[PDB]
């Protein structure tokens with residue numbers, strides 16, 4: 001859906017920014033510094049889940065640019081695996097949120113976080 005590569009770069013960076021916000025805003029809850037309201041969390045995780053599926057389609061062929069490493073394109077299969085694992089961890093977070101269990105949530109949150117990091121290590125400049 002993009003006219004120039006720059007437009008895909010801007011879309012994905014935007015999507016990733018939103019994801020960051022929706023994920024990162026739960027840190028105080030998870031650490032116990034903010035109160036835990038199951039419903040609030042469930043709903044935030046629902047938004048997070050939607051957002052988390054969005055960036056990937058904006059790393060299509062010829063969208064080189066931004067802080068994305070070329071390896072994303074040279075090593076597509078490995079990138080895809082990285083994204084799938086990430087999304088899978090997201091499913092897990094969602095399950096924890098739906099169960100309204102802080103322990104499970106904390107654990108799941110950590111797993112999501114390691115997944116973001118694993119990708120960045122390999123594919124973000």
Ligand code: HEC
Nearest residue numbers: 013016017020023066067068082083086115116119123124
């Ligand atoms: C690979 C499968 C990734 C996963 C999982 C996550 N991120 Fe990442 N992120 C990735 C790339 C290749 C890039 C660079 C994109 C570019 O074209 O510039 C990024 C970038 C970000 C950013 C920066 C956004 C901006 O303002 O430019 C943020 C804030 C970011 N990523 C955060 C983030 C978080 C919080 C994740 C887990 C919830 C996450 N990313 C997963 C690749 C991948």
